[model samples]
Target: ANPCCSNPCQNRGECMSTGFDQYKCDCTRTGFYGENCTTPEFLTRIKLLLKPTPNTVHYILTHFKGVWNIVNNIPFLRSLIMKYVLTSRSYLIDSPPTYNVHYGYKSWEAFSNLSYYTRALPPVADDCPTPMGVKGNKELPDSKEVLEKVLLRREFIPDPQGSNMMFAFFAQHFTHQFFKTDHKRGPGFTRGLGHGVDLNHIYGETLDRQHKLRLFKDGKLKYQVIGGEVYPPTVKDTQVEMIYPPHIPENLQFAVGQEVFGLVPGLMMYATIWLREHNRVCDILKQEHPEWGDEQLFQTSRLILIGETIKIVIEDYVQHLSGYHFKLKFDPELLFNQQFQYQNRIASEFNTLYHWHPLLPDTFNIEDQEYSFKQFLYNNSILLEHGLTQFVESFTRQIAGRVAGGRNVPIAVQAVAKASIDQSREMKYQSLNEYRKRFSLKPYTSFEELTGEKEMAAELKALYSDIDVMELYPALLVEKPRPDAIFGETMVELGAPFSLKGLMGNPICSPQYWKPSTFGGEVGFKIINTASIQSLICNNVKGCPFTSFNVQ
Candidate 1:
């Protein structure tokens, strides 16, 4: 009897008769392994043994909580542990320079240019799927059709982990600083002034813009008071042009570092807080060094603010994202003398991975009054009318939409989704499985395994016959989220590498610059060390309401 006649394989595995009563199932690209292709490749024997749960739990109990916090507080010990964890998980601290170019490698004109995005994988021949066209015997699904079916949210699904609007807003405000897309040039390029987390969103991207936003006295950014509340100076007052919809009143426009911040309330709120912080830090520096000039005070305060931003990002924001019991630290000294590149570069894939429109709901309920997505845009007036404390509290209490698929992104912002997909193709990004292998994760064996929803899997299967051919952008959003986490496993894996790499590689983390002297002595250093999201809000916002990324 022929073994192949009985179809003795699973997950679309090809069965071939080797001899009488014998057969070998070819599991290539099937996302499975073993004789019958029954076992998931991710759960192989080696991976099961190497899974970090046991070790992570042990480390968390021994070094994180209780008396261990004090005993393990030493910089050397903390650094050693950090280095071990990052390396053991295969996060490369000292990766080879991307040596990325604009187009070709032949000319010095394009070699090692910083304007272009860094690539995690080398360039490959363009095999972009055409909209409603054939690609390698498989008929490609229409991009628009895919969005309507697989991407759009039919009903709002709340995040299983209880993340709130504040979390989504904070993520948007944070990533905007570094993921500066050069829309004019295209998605493959960036308009970012530099690679590291310089807080360009707070301190304008260019020196000229920075000059316009600065007060030029007492090392403070310009601010104005309206309705007895402090805010960034209005565009009319600053005489700086801000992009806003025509319907938005001129008085409501804010002249901040980023023009987009003027249009979004959450972004405006952060800008206001950071602006207040910069002025407050300037005052502190002035008190300590009374003889210091404006330039010296401004520079020192800027450095301190940047340090504060990085600390909050690592300790609060990223810790929430990780959902790991082990507390993550912002000990830059861990990388000192380490064999790693101190310079940072934003990867193009990182930009695509952060398209979190699905997190936004159709309506925002602020202090009992609901605002539609359209009204929320360019609506800084809400911040003024409701006041900062109420605004902040409202977002904290409001539940955010889940990051999963099916019309989650509101109709108003669906254009953004289309553009993102188009950009991925334009950049010629590799498939989802390709990115998974790059990040050292197992390639998903089937659409069902990837999405955890049979209907979605079936839809994806129709569009992409093989799981290996699924595009990165769509697959990333639809992937099954990790238990009690905001993002899927692949997203976590991809994001952690780029985020940790960039954050740790900041110029401020250098041995010479990381000292107290660089941040204007012991007081500034203390301020930075103690900085947290809660602290920042309480310090800047009057009557600071309870703040947490998770729903209260």
Candidate 2:
């Protein structure tokens, strides 16, 4: 089949045959360029490294400083300017205010689409996504290949700072509830709606919609309490009987946690605690507003749950991770006007980057007791076999693994990283260098700058002498950490704005939620807007005390 037979070019461009497996689009529009005439000419201009032709050079040179070009004619000054531009972290859109409008894409829709994101082809299209590496070019190894060879060190790092695992647990629960996960259960078009922390429990949204309107015999919402924790009833108990077979007991059947849970004890504990909290709030509201119906109780409690979740994440979790004594805040004044349409959908890139798998420690010390985290891997035995109090104690007091270099990682984290790269390649993202350019950071000039370590840099150079061809994931792993920050500045720039802006866009963050009559009421606001992971666990998780939790 001819490569041009399918007419891949857009804007009615003529497809010209160029080679055995290549072609070019002679675009009818002067405004577009690239093999398919899909990218705009202005974007094509800013991405180049002064590698313009005789015709385009005049146009390109005008964008640069006349002084820089006057000096660029000199060999020494040319090299000096190139070095500074290639190594610096200077960006066209570096912070929040400018960030809302200036992502590399043209508009929000283009950024939202997976096709537009994965469309980077190298040499001709230097804007390739970092996950894909160079297309059909194995001269440089991909992330999965490099990680298996140089980054397979599964040794555990003991920080001794007692960086609590509750941080990780709480983070996982919150993100899963906040973000819309693609289970890849159906076709590409069947994307799910944006999720909320409604605490709908095990009965997922669809199943619960059937029975959630009905009131319980006692005039409270229809919820079940089993294992001494509250949960939404199983819409189909028969379906969950397979995930945990008998001995779980037929009478004890209830909806499991969200789609991501039931895989680990620590994660399961956090889900259960939140479920109990929602039920507790429902009971509180029932006591105060006896005239309220079941639907009103559910809606009000869910509103309170979301408000509190956002509050703790911003006020507590984000502050703890900000590296300095900086306090994070949520200000609605920054939100867009109601006339402006806002959506809080999560990007796939967010999920791809959200993984901080290294935070799971290989072993933990709870109340002077040592336990191998490996023993709890993939099994919820700790929650089911031992007392729940023992699990909560370990959850509150144990330290998390460090995420600087891939120095001391758990085997699970290493395997997951490897798997993620394989998927990234299969989906055709660009090389790490391309991603750096997209993120507006200066691309690494050499492997030495990329790793900041001589020996590792040497190894990377041996594999990829051309710095432009580096894999994105390992480059992210080895980039020198920002001062007192856990990861490099590139990742921080990638994550924080998207997460924060998503919060700002959500209608739930409006001032009405904080008012005295609604979720803004004293008890509700205090619970929703102020509880830390440590504070929440101590106040709610039975038998746990605030003084006993080792939050370091």
Candidate 3:
């Protein structure tokens, strides 16, 4: 009989039920405990599992249909060609905790052929808009054809026309070595880093300011010796922002792709461009050591961008879990996570767009221009697409479970699309905790901390200038509290990518899970943002340079 089953001890301990007469539970030895023996380690586990991978509301630019028209007729020295190119279209996602949605494609025909949004698999499985039409979606798109018809690739045929060689030559060089990104154990790490064990970025040193400086994610700088940890800063990665094709949010505003998201300028588009430029040297690594050769530089930078790619991909995937971009029937609209990051914005995170330059390519087995862009984007695309696909499937399952506890017509599309349930009754809502708890057995933890206390919430509000705490407080407190649920306070403990604590490794392996009991109320939503911080760490442990200086 386990004492936990009968009396349910609320301390950091395990429950044991000795059948007949004797029963007891194990308690955690660490400074950890909850009314139900809930140890802090459990929270950490939950975080690892449910802590939405950092940034959610992020977008990476890709070809609209993966096709481009070469328009090789323009003669140019500095001739700017202004042309209307049909860009990628988007839709509000169908998932809860909204995110703006756009379909993924290996090519244009794949995207155009998707008639309705379906999410089953082999027979369906593509997450593009179901009714994606001209103007991005309106009235089934005039001809039942995606509006504005024929997708076109705007062209740029530099200097002398008809010169793919010239284009390929210069682009190859510029995009590869010369424009390499400055080190930051960041997304840049993933972009350039492929050395595997020699460049494994999971381990960390002490947790202080000096050691903190080594809390990097990209380039070769993380290998520098500073205060007993690796802090080397003499490497680079391709911090290319030219990846995400130009997109304005207004382009997705309903049935007409006028401006991005219908009205305002594509701020997100601007931010995407801004981020790529802000991720490099001038902020992360600017001082070039005259001694470092080209290959050494390459080794250092590739890992950094690679790291950034991983972080951005996970984050972007998490954003899809949120119903931020859809109608109010979802999470009732708002960017709660956006405000969580403002407090974490470091100098590296805020690097100005003006200072960023593409990585130089003359150093490696590549032309300067082409290699880096492909490396930067191809890696990012894979990371983002894979992670998001998994996250959406997992989250949808979780959401379904959460709603299952409350009512039959518990969810939005499920109830409505099924047709049996009435709309008015299905509109009923639950607390955030309930929403998550029902779906995922995986725990949920806040990066910064979530609270019900008006004062604590106020602190959170002040921490992030973007938070509208007042609006949120009334909704949460209106509901009844759960046993042992601390309504006066709650926190979303942040880790690695958000805290620079885990860029050395993926947080997924450890799983910090948080189980939020749904607090009842109308949680108003808005769109907010989080940024990528890149740091490059070099393995100068052996101090080898030109790892492949002249590899043929």
Candidate 4:
């Protein structure tokens, strides 16, 4: 006992006297090894810290800065422009990944064919550990729980300059268009249905073969057409459910899938416009190709729709999000020359990295009178009462929440943010540091540098005294956003190519799919060049005001 009391074991190993002349050291329990635990493995150090390295963020940021015009010079006007006129620009980057597939090389065919969803991501920390919370010394607080404090409500001051409705609106539309993750637990849940822009308006429900989607003689999708405007078909679902916008009287409903139609008023309105656009295009196609039957009409219309979606994403959406309009190109040659590999299918890690729900607005301005979201949950009475023109004015004309800061996200944003992080953790993703390393990004040297906010950074220091302990989701969220970007350098780098390539790599946009007969040819190209959120609403929503939304 006296000999052991001298502390023969090293590296915090417990030493106990085994015999009169010998001592026993528990070497198996710690990162140290060999006799007396004197030799510590390089990887098994008390805390592994990364050396911060200069990244290509500035190069990318410089490209973004080149695009900002004089309007960006005035902060208030700029905020308003970004909030309303450029509604969907920043929303795309909010939650980029949902399928959670590993982000490596896969054939464009494999991605489109839906094989990448089967691969599994590696495991990470079982619990969110922190130094100041319970299990202070050993583990961090549950990440899901700790993240709640940062979730929902305004995460920053002066509000994010964007509306909560803008993000929720398109997110629903996009979800309806693509991204159907199987509901089953764990990796067993397949990322079912590529959710192509093909517009499975019925939410993949298998209707009787005789049942064709109702459309007018002109090929416009038949709506319930209440109030002399387009609305989804009357809800046959349960009293509480119809679609993402939820229960609305048949008079207000639009003809679309119940899976996620009309969940929110903004969502309802957003879906309404797209539904109208599709029907509008269908009518045009019918007129253009009189001999073509419903099957051919639908097929050709869908082909054109997909092409337009890709074009907008590449030309408008990607450029707006990346702030690199000129530098980023969606060239087919990039794929033909084998410049970059493709994973046509969505990836799990991409979804994990894409968790940007904190962008939701708590109280959105509706015609100058701010209304809390609580009053409007599952209700679109406002749209019906005020009509589409007024509703459109509220969002399209009003400023939206900020995309760059985490300051004040709404409850919906908060809940989704937590759900995303929790879902990622459940999938057993590789460590945060590992992802940073994979992305070729340098981890911050310390908490202070990682989160510039003193209080948050201090808490992070208390939680992960060693930067190595920081989890991936929280770490990425806290890292400084790149100049003119809503996301940090790591996020921007990882997401930009994945999204841009995904759009460009699709075979639908390839030369084979671009023939005169195929993507509706000249008409389809017009849709690509001309389709914008404002035009969709103004053209189809009947009473929608303003020929064009002005960002200035």
Collision count for each candidate, in order: 6, 8, 157, 56
lDDT of 3 by residue, 1-552 (tens): 212222333332334446745545455563345655455676567655564421221111112212112322332311121110000000111111111012221234322322222110001012222211111221121211110111111121111111112112222221222122233522111122211111122211112311322324332223322234222122122111122233412212111100111111112111222222223431333234345443333333333333333343234322222212211111101112211111111111111111111111211121122223334321322222222223222212221111100111112113222221111011111123322222221222331233323543433334322221111112122212222211111111111122121121222112220111110011100110122211111111112121110111
Provide the TM-score for each candidate, comma-separated: 0.84, 0.69, 0.21, 0.71
| Alpha-carbon lDDT, every model | 0.75, 0.53, 0.22, 0.52
Per-residue lDDT tens digits of candidate 1, residues 1-552? 344443356554656668876889888876688898778876555666767653244445434455556535776666676776554543432253452324312234334666777666433333323321123233345778778778887788888767888888888988888787878887878878576688878778888888888898888899998988888987777776678888777678888877787778888988898899999999999999999888899899999988998899888888776665556788876666566666777888888898988888778878989999778878887888788898789988888877754447666788889888877766756577767865656778999999877998998898778787788888878888765456677777777778887877788888879999898899999999999989999988888768988886
Q: What is the alpha-carbon lDDT for the whole of candidate 4? A: 0.52
Cα error of candidate 2 at position 429, Å: 1.8
Off by over 4 Å in 1: 1-79, 88-96, 99-111, 126-139, 405-407
Clashing pairs in 2: 128-430, 129-430, 130-430, 132-429, 132-430, 162-552, 308-528, 514-520
Could you list the CA RMSD of all candidates, in the order they appear?
A: 8.0, 11.5, 25.9, 10.8
Model 1 residue 472 distance off true place after TM-score fit, in angstroms: 0.8
Candidate with more favorable, higher lDDT: 1 or 3: 1
Worst 10 residues of 2 by lDDT: 93-102
Per TM-score, the best of the predicted structures is 1
Which residue window of length 10 is worst by lDDT in model 4? 85-94
Query: Best-fitting candidate, measured by lDDT?
Result: 1
